[PDB]
């Protein structure tokens, strides 16, 4: 018995579900309540765009929502939220604060950790980022042969990669006048090799993103880039004009050949998967400009404030979190699909696979007892309409219930053909959730087939295949335009959803002990791959795979 | 009750699982059987590289595998296979044959549909492709100002896009002397606009992929490309040097301005999600050359024969399918992760999201009866080590069982740093499945904590969070090298896996009636978006969303 399962509000939810779930049908709910949209949607005015969070096409009633809010209160969500914002060490397995909200604290209200306001250091780094971006983008910063920088290459793994990549992809229209950005993350040599082949050492700037500056994959990639660079430049002192670090390890950064005045710091209370708001976002600021980076921070700051000051029943991240709890812990849905109808957001779902799954893919509660319920879902998705033409067949007519978040900006960055493309995109965004909710009954389908002139035999044969059961729930999140500020707000909104869910489950959303074993076992296997000897030190499978690898690496195909 | 649930072998499988589920622990299974890898792995020599399908880190015993194979026999897998290969109309809801295997039938052994051999038509199109490719690649084919083609842009959705994109990405090293390739699929105007912004109309060749040549999204994109082209070229007759078609609609192709000689045909027995082997693969052949395209076809042909002649108990696609049935229909796993440790294969999982999910995300059986069991799983993943640093926390320490296919080539296309990068990649590939299988016990973690000098209190506090329960099953698929031939073999293997699961579930893997409703509803919404008038013709949510869109159209942000 974990905290969640012992909670009385949760038990009430489970009981309601057992006795009413058979009665949850979206067509009937909408048919019976013309005010349903008004009662189950939230409109936020950020002053830089509106966000409509329409959660009306969910398998919930007023009572369900009331009970879910009651659960949030019973589980101490608000108090936990205050602990985070106040700089308390809520990352309890690692004794650390959790302060990505400090990174984007534009108001500069003091946030104390161990007796010291963190804002001065947050702002010192931001100031350094701003100066650097101005120098690089303006052409002031010269390469070793006196040329301007045309390409910036971020080298990092996990949280040092996904955020910056997703945001620069999403904000590509705001990069006029910025250098090209490249992301190298995989230790797979293909990644760095194929990137370097397209670059000029005289005009490329590498950004090595690693807090410790000892991260294996990242430093290997970094060392490979340096070797390539020196092959052309020869002079070790030239490295300082072409490599900067996002790290705190001054000695290692200096030893690499980077001038430490170009080491951009961040802190223990910045989790990698919450780090794009820090120095880690340097490649974003370089690409779209520091002004745009500040707008991104400001958007997140707005949402932070929304989350902090809004009554639970009208609090966007809380409601999203609660809906997820309902589908995960009552309906048992393993996954959560994120489907932005926006090609610029093509890596948004991939970003939340880390942000969500690495945060809440957990099983030990704060008290040390194992959970006896589900925790975080498997997050997945492709942007519409691409995903729509790949896997929606399964969403509409498969055997899995799959909560989906559909997202779209009202205004497109590319209003080509007098808005025709965006009109079709919007129509599909709307129709898909409508279809998922409504379905098509046997009766309706039969009438279509008859109207189509199908013979009775053909009709009876095809009929069942044309039926859509519907009742498939979705959220529709519509926002004015995907600007830097609005993206900031949207990302922060999901960060706080994830936080609320973790508090409810009583897990630690901010550690990641689950990455350790794989790292340990890889270090053991590395040296064993060298040479031609048979390996017999592991289970038979691991041995067998290693031995096949040894046999085949000498094969001439 | 559906076919599967009525099947005596399936019931036998279920009884066994009910009786012995808790007898399935990988760590113990491997400790008890030193020959486990040997008994639960396949080695395939294709003459152009080996494939090791190591399915030993799965929750199975010899009895379980026997029962699974017996299930495949009972469900008539072999007879269904022969029907496919013999050109019978196994796509029963549409009354069509399913002959992607004919597209790569290098043997040219006759395959008849309605008494007529399809190979001549297949080969005629292939010869056409070969000639066109030679002309474009050699510089013989020139644009409207006499320049050679430097860029090829494929415009299509779903199956007309994903396969060609995935394969050209995977085979990038083999594209020397080929034009760059671009893929435009999203109706979102950003996709075509950001693509066209980087192109010169004088040296760009557009490939319009659509059987009917009336596909709304594809044709909208195509017309946008043509308008951009003509803004530069002016002369309508120049469209014929810059646009070709993958279609059978001669009339519409001619009307578009394409020379009918440059219409590359395919057939109703080529499913879109099985079409890269046909004319739909033209961009592949253009990028990496027709010879490399033939090698891709040849690899698939090799795997088709393996699937055809190998006893079920040692038949790769069959075993992969059967393991999936075990996890889906007995263990209840909703998902299947595909994790290639290969950056070139970064779009492999996405491809199989359509291939698998659009095929088997079904709920009506051959007899018209609704299934009463699960069908296709939710397929997802990212390449290692990228995904490894994103979401593996949840795979190791979350509350979901997630069957994972780990894939990797022994030989890298980029053996930089004297093989150091690939060494580290392989070590992680190996360590991850080893870790997932083995886990780390309370006692093992305790010993580590003591050794690190943790106080008893600190130790007891952290201990449970450091435990890995393990027993997480995986397949490891290792192949000599990712050449065009090997990629063909791999994709075909998965195609047949999907086919086998579909036969077992008694669903139609080859239709997609699930896409109709959304299309119908979108068509109704399009004209409603025009104008300022409030919409009230739908459910309250759909109306509300539309009205918010109309409102926010007018906002300046």
UniProtKB/Swiss-Prot annotation, chains A, B:
Known catalytic reactions: alpha-D-glucose 6-phosphate = beta-D-fructose 6-phosphate
Residues bearing the modification Phosphothreonine: 109, 250
Effect of residue 224 to M: In CNSHA4; GPI Iwate
PTM annotation (N-acetylalanine): residues: 2
Annotated active site: 358, 389, 519
Enzyme Commission designation: 5.3.1.9
Subcellular location field: Cytoplasm; Secreted
Protein name: Glucose-6-phosphate isomerase
């Amino acid at each position: 018995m974990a905290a969640l399962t012992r909670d009385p509000q949760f038990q009430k939810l489970q009981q309601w579900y057992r006795e009413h779930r058979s009665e949850l049908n979206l067509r009937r709910l909408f048919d019976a309540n013309k005010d349903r949209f008004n009662h189950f949607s939230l409109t936020l005015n950020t002053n830089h765009g509106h966000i409509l969070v329409d959660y009306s096409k969910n398998l919930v009633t007023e009572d369900v929502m009331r009970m879910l809010v009651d659960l949030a209160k019973s589980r101490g969500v608000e108090a936990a939220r205050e602990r985070m914002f106040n700089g308390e060490k809520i990352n309890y397995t690692e004794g650390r604060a959790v302060l990505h909200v400090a990174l984007r604290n534009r108001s500069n209200t003091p946030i104390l950790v161990d007796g010291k306001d963190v804002m001065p250091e947050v702002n010192k780094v931001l100031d350094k980022m701003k100066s650097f971006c101005q120098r690089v983008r303006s052409g002031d910063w010269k390469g070793y042969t006196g040329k301007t920088i045309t390409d910036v290459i971020n080298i990092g793994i996990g949280g040092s990669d996904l955020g910056p990549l997703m945001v620069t992809e999403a904000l590509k229209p705001y990069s006029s006048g910025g250098p090209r950005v490249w992301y190298v993350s995989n230790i797979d040599g293909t990644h760095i090799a194929k990137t370097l082949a397209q670059l000029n050492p005289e005009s490329s700037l590498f950004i090595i993103a690693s807090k410790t500056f000892t991260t294996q994959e990242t430093i290997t990639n970094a060392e490979t880039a340096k070797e390539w660079f020196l092959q052309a430049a020869k002079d070790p002192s030239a490295v300082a004009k072409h490599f900067v670090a996002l790290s705190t390890n001054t000695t290692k950064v200096k030893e690499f050949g980077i001038d430490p005045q170009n080491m951009f710091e961040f802190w223990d209370w910045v989790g990698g998967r919450y780090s794009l708001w820090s120095a880690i976002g340097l490649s974003i600021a370089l690409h779209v400009g520091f002004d745009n980076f500040e707008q991104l921070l400001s958007g997140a700051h707005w949402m932070d404030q929304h989350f902090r000051t809004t009554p639970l029943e009208k609090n966007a991240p809380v409601l999203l979190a609660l809906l997820g709890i309902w589908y995960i812990n009552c309906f048992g849905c393993e996954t959560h699909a994120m489907l932005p109808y926006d090609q610029y957001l093509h890596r948004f779902a991939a970003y939340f696979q880390q942000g969500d799954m690495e945060s809440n893919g957990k099983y030990i509660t704060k008290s040390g007892t194992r959970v006896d319920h589900q925790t975080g879902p498997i997050v997945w998705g492709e942007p519409g309409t691409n995903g729509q033409h790949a896997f929606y067949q399964l969403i509409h007519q498969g055997t899995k219930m799959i909560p989906c978040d559909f997202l779209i900006p009202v205004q497109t960055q590319h209003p080509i053909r007098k808005g025709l493309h965006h009109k079709i995109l919007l129509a599909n965004f709307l129709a898909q959730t409508e279809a998922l909710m409504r379905g098509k009954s046997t009766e309706e389908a039969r009438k279509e087939l008859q109207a189509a002139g199908k013979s009775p035999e053909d009709l009876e044969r095809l009929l069942p295949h044309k039926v859509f059961e519907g009742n498939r729930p979705t959220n529709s999140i519509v926002f004015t335009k995907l600007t830097p500020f609005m993206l900031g707000a949207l990302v922060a909104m999901y960060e706080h959803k994830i936080f609320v869910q973790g508090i409810i489950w009583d897990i630690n959303s901010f550690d990641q002990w689950g990455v350790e074993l794989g790292k340990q076992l890889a270090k053991k296997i590395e040296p064993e791959l060298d040479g031609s000897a048979q390996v017999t030190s592991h289970d038979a499978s691991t041995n067998g795979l290693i031995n096949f690898i040894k046999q085949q690496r000498e094969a001439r195909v």
